[PDB]
Write a protein that binds this ligand. Structure first.
Ligand SMILES: O=C1c2ccccc2C(=O)c2cc(S(=O)(=O)O)c(O)cc21
Ligand SMILES: O=C1c2ccccc2C(=O)c2cc(S(=O)(=O)O)c(O)cc21
Ligand SMILES: O=P(O)(O)OC[C@H]1O[C@](O)(COP(=O)(O)O)[C@@H](O)[C@@H]1O
Ligand SMILES: O=P(O)(O)OC[C@H]1O[C@](O)(COP(=O)(O)O)[C@@H](O)[C@@H]1O
Ligand SMILES: O=P(O)(O)OC[C@H]1O[C@](O)(COP(=O)(O)O)[C@@H](O)[C@@H]1O
Ligand SMILES: O=P(O)(O)OC[C@H]1O[C@](O)(COP(=O)(O)O)[C@@H](O)[C@@H]1O
Ligand SMILES: O=C([O-])C(=O)[O-]
Ligand SMILES: O=C([O-])C(=O)[O-]
Ligand SMILES: O=C([O-])C(=O)[O-]
Ligand SMILES: O=C([O-])C(=O)[O-]
Ligand SMILES: [K+]
Ligand SMILES: [K+]
Ligand SMILES: [K+]
Ligand SMILES: [K+]
Ligand SMILES: [Mg+2]
Ligand SMILES: [Mg+2]
Ligand SMILES: [Mg+2]
Ligand SMILES: [Mg+2]
Lengths: 425, 425, 436, 418
């Protein structure tokens, strides 16, 4: 229908130049797709109540950040328990349940150059409490990441390390830090004090570009909706900053004081949700996909080869979704790196992977709870059907839509190799 | 890894170029072709090439399609030539490395306001003798194609109709002719008499471009190696013409007097084979694939969606082949329209489809004769392994290579929707 | 590497590490982003004009001199506040501060005066206060009018009529502040001299999360039309009370410049805030960084592809001059102009080279601040007897002022744009000159 | 519309091909020069006049055949035929004289030294140097031309594997290149010649140096009045590849249809030039051309850009050595580059550059240099109007310098005709 091609900035998406794409942007072209940039909300006094956390999950919070620069271990353990209680209150309806990751943000090393003794204790707390992600403060070189990895021990091998780049050295040694990290956070608060304030946008755009090229998650953080700590509506510069972080290519956007101590934590999450949806529809996919394809090197890994084939197939038919089965989240991450317009519905049995895939733009995790079928092919199908049924209930899919299904040839992680075109019935 | 020597062969340095101009500058006479020749050679069978022994040499030199010119000879003469082609083809039905399907094409005498009486009788002869293709002379409009189609009677609706464009009217009404035809022949001999000789190259390039866009076979014909009718080596203009027809995007190249009446029919086939191999490696795939992608409209047909995904996947890993299961040849044709560098190995149970897929550039037919397996999934596996084993035998594949496999979810033609990445064991 | 090797040996590796030149050479926008370097210092003069609202904190002659030195190019008078007497005193103080630097072309900096109207209310036509304020503007010789709540082409015709026969030279910049203005944008742009994305009211009239779409669309369409576009309101809002802005604020200023805005504005930051000079300095610092980060390769190609063919010699000469400037890394394009039009046509192709506009019109020197990258030089000398000698003196004036202001250095190449006969509308010549 | 303008507007090369129309007639003057080998079949003054009218721009003398006396008579006949049209200065066509050497045997041969000296003594404009395999071969030819042959253009013939492999060093010291396909097709596999031709044409286009496509282009026309389909395609594809010149050997030297062979190359080249996809070509030439601080180079790109913006009918350039016209030509404008020169040698040599139309200025000098420049500009306009290049109302780009003498081009002006 003509109405379909007038929504989600589709006239602007057809444009032959980026300039014509901008000229075709329409404020009356409503967003259709689900919001794909994850929202990280920092947990504090304004956001610890189980009932308030349920409202934040419904507003769109995907990752709960625990800032270990404030509070004690006892305070953060209660935060974790309240988050888990609010999250599990929706587990009774498995088709609508929303996993929420728990990220520990470290205090950092201060005047010290190595891992501080408090960071070692906080990192061991994180492993003991089952955190999914570590936002490592003031990462300046690859050996800082190795020290964080060592302090997590053998039981914290699955935790994702997102390196916070907050000073000149971190920016200059970016490539070596990215290589050993799972992702990056553009920590603009300290970065804007360590380097001239007028240069932060260059560092943000450079880091987001490099992370997009590497296929690794990148978080844009600090003062995105600062005025919403005390005011019900943000400034024009604030909404523009959120939209531009999404247009830059950020996988995640963050709220600090806006959710930790402000008077409008739920409204701040709703605002980031609303802006991100508008900005994602305004992304010029024609140039973005072409450039991501061109820049990505050749690969002999079947997961990587299947992912590019699936993204290309999704664009060819305007697929509503790519449903992928994943153990560690890696197959969903490799789909996400090509920035499909189609939602990547990741079906997993790993509760940790379901939480961690929120770091990847456009990945919608579904935690499958059913016990395995005796016939492996029947177990793969029931999981694909669970992805379809959840997608229909959540509005991602409708009867008649085309979907791309990404699976593997045998059980266990690392064997994704099949892409299939499926019609929704 | 593949090694530096791998990336110096088959014009791979020129293939990596960021502009067409840089691509030309990087062409290297020392960069040897490795891939199998993908542009089919059509040889006209006549006095100089009728004998079974001579036909065996032409099959070994590279002839894929035997053309019978019904402007000369008689039904009895052409029936003997067809029987001799079939005898030469079946002489290799033992050795798997040597059995190659050869299509039989009937070229009509031509047209009054409809089909000539002799054309009606010759078309009936073609149906009775089981020809695969009809090269229809002097097609001027869509109703000329309908008359040939009607003449192919109740038993020959599977015969491919390749319309010969030989006059101003055929060029002007090209779009309507292409729409109802299976493919096109740029019949340069008569075209060069009907329109100014200096305009033929415009008509050839236009028709090849439009056929490439439509995903339909296009043949470049007449005077390609003309001087080889009397001389053992062609002129510099002749080798250039063959190379340029391949670079233009022709699916097939033809020999007329060169093979029908000249003194060097086998040498003419060998020469076209040598030039086509060199010219295919010099194709600028980066721009070609991007432009085929951009120009091709969105599709909700799973075969078309799977084909673009499979070709994208093949480029990502430098796949040695795309093995496709096809009954009518359509799935192989849809892969061929995206011009993959990988060979498209079409595994079929149909002898007719195996002969007819020679019209599509880069399609290597394998006729499969084993009795069916009771379990359909096992029968599919048996054919995929037939394609892999034939490939290892013919040189295409080695253990450790990656191949793309294209199948459907259920038996019967028209359900292609799966693309799998396999590692050769 | 081969397309920059000879110029790299000549100008040096240090030259090609500054002003985001490695990022400028990139073959894709993604590679361009990856190559952005915080250690690559900006060298070029700041080309996006700063509009500062003059009010209680920025009114004194001494304070205004500090703001002119910090980078203010256009002084905005908000007729939603104050009185005619109050605004006349502000204008006189701006003119006194501006004329305190008139002793030499090396120290002189023309500053435009813009009147921002109160607007219509529930009425669908020009208000009686707007008619009186517009007549005040003509009587006080304002250069620009920022017309509030423009909703259709007839609104700009009403403003034009209220300016009378003596206000024909005043530029009308239509403020787009509601859904109707956005929807009827094309007809408004066609009859306006430029546009202002007035984000404060726009953010109340349409959903706040959609303002960025309207800003990017309007900037893109203005860039395509070759007409000035201003980005306004809350750019450095927190600097009204704090000496440093938020991370969202610096990002917003940089992104308005990257979007393609010709001007950026300060409202409460300079009108009532505690750091008016620091707010101007901050916009100046961010704009210089953001201009160097512009991906000129894609921008120039897209401006070329989208712009239709032209039989106007000024337009033909402008594209040739900008192409020539990119080929040699010209330090400047010196253009002779009467109305500012030849400089505006150069500016629409977004050259990296500074467009030094040499003019005798004091009003045109003030108004060309609306066009990104235009540096106005007011020529005060009486005409030479031979017109060709007069033109040559004006060209040399621009070269000597350019050398003394640091825009030009010995060994630099400059592009000179002039016409074949006197009077407006005859630009048709492009010359390549080496600086000695 | 005419001159393949619908196909020129296309957003992709594939859509450009699809839009090519056999009914879209060429309007622009033929840009690719024709080199005709002068021999027994084309030696007479009367025959040479018909070849000049058919489109011959460069006369090639093959020093592998004949004698010095034979070639001197051929040269005199060419000059006599050329000067028979000098009575009408606004339509006169300069014709270059090129000497093609016999080549080495195993260094520069003694016969080549004598033939090169003959060329200097007879005032040849170009030398097609046979079997160039390294930069030192070009230096030897240059030295054998002596101090009086400093102005002769050396076009290196690439005819073997070594010449192809050492191409970059040969191009660096040569004025241009000839893809000598006859010997190249014997020295390397015949099926690889097209790769060497396309690579060499691409590199010459990038370097801004003339490239000639030669041998067997219309071979069958030695005995037949019409060429084969492969032959017309080969000529069209050499033009589409980017060749500045196309050549005729036996077709004009010993064949039965020398005038028809020239007419055929003229007809094909005109059609192929209109089918060039300028949108991609200009952008790629621009992207690849390095940054430059040379005002002639800077003015040339500005002039070509300005010509495309207004669909200028021509770029009129004043040139002493032909260099300013060559720098315009390297950007492949659709507009004709009308080169107004006082140098008869430069007028002949500038035929090596695609799209350059030389006008030999023989009008009286004006007293004031500025007035003299303006009259040379008006001469280009009047010749253009008479020859069909220009009409009243057209826009032209005029390229001049700031002071007399070679090397000072720095001005581009936009002018409306009449
Ligand atoms: O002499 C021919 C002949 C004689 C007797 C029976 C058949 C043939 C025959 O098929 C043929 C085809 C071509 S062409 O390549 O189609 O032009 C010829 O040029 C010449 C003959
Ligand atoms: O208090 C103000 C004032 C008081 C008395 C006379 C004039 C002014 C005045 O011009 C102004 C402008 C702005 S704004 O930047 O336009 O929003 C303000 O925010 C506040 C004032
Ligand atoms: O993305 P990952 O972690 O590599 O997981 C993908 C794996 O998931 C599967 O699709 C399903 O495997 P399981 O049945 O073990 O869940 C495997 O075939 C595939 O290898
Ligand atoms: O190219 P075609 O003619 O549509 O054939 C493709 C068909 O071949 C298959 O892959 C195998 O089918 P069969 O087992 O019937 O041969 C089907 O799943 C698919 O529909
Ligand atoms: O930019 P504008 O308003 O068109 O003015 C450009 C004009 O200035 C000139 O360069 C010089 O004109 P004046 O001598 O009248 O100042 C003219 O040749 C040209 O027409
Ligand atoms: O192309 P070339 O050899 O540099 O010649 C261009 C020269 O011709 C001119 O346009 C005219 O000079 P002359 O008066 O010497 O003929 C010069 O201004 C310029 O330097
Ligand atoms: O630590 C942080 O989040 C910061 O510095 O912005
Ligand atoms: O009929 C043909 O083959 C021709 O005319 O080229
Ligand atoms: O009028 C204004 O400046 C606004 O609305 O932002
Ligand atoms: O000498 C030549 O011209 C050749 O060999 O092609
Ligand atoms: K912290
Ligand atoms: K026939
Ligand atoms: K106002
Ligand atoms: K010779
Ligand atoms: Mg910090
Ligand atoms: Mg025919
Ligand atoms: Mg307002
Ligand atoms: Mg030779």
């Amino acid at each position: 229908g003509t109405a379909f091609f007038q929504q989600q900035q589709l006239p602007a998406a057809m444009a032959d130049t980026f300039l014509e794409h901008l000229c075709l942007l329409d404020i009356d072209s409503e967003p259709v797709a689900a919001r794909s940039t994850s929202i990280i909300a920092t947990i504090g006094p304004a956001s610890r109540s189980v009932e308030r956390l349920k409202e934040m999950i419904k507003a769109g919070m995907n990752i709960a950040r625990l800032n270990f620069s404030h509070g004690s271990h006892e305070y953060h353990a209660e935060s974790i328990a309240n988050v888990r209680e609010a999250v599990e209150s929706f587990a009774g309806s498995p088709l609508s349940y929303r996993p929420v990751a728990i990220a520990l943000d470290t205090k950092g090393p201060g005047s010290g150059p190595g891992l501080s003794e408090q960071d070692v204790r906080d990192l061991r707390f994180g492993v003991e409490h089952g955190v999914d992600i570590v936002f490592a403060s003031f990462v300046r070189k690859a050996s800082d990441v190795a020290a964080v990895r060592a302090a997590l021990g053998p039981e914290g091998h699955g935790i994702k390390i997102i390196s916070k780049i907050e000073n000149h050295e971190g920016v200059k040694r970016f490539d070596e830090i990215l290589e050993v990290s799972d992702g990056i956070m553009v920590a603009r608060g300290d970065l804007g004090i360590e380097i001239p304030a007028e240069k932060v946008f260059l560092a943000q755009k450079m880091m987001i570009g490099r992370c997009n090229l590497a296929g690794k998650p990148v978080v844009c953080a600090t003062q995105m909706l600062e005025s919403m700590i005390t005011k019900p509506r943000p400034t024009r510069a604030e909404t523009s900053d959120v939209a531009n972080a999404v247009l830059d290519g950020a996988d995640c956007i963050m709220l600090s004081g806006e959710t930790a101590k402000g008077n409008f934590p739920v409204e701040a999450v709703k605002m980031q949700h609303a802006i991100a949806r508008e900005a994602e529809a305004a992304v010029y996919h024609r140039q973005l996909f072409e450039e991501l394809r061109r820049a990505a090197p050749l690969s002999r890994d079947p997961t990587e080869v299947t992912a590019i084939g699936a993204v290309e197939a999704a664009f060819k038919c305007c697929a509503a979704a790519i449903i992928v089965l994943t153990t560690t989240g890696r197959s969903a991450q490799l789909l996400s790196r090509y920035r499909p317009r189609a939602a990547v519905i990741a079906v997993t049995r790993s509760a940790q992977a379901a939480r961690q895939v929120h770091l990847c733009r456009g990945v919608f995790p579904l935690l499958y709870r059913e016990p395995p079928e005796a016939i492996w092919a029947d177990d793969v199908d029931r999981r694909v059907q669970f992805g379809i049924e959840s997608g229909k209930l959540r509005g991602f899919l409708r009867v008649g839509d085309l979907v791309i299904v990404v699976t593997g040839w045998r059980p266990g992680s690392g064997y994704t190799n099949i892409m299939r075109v499926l019609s929704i019935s």
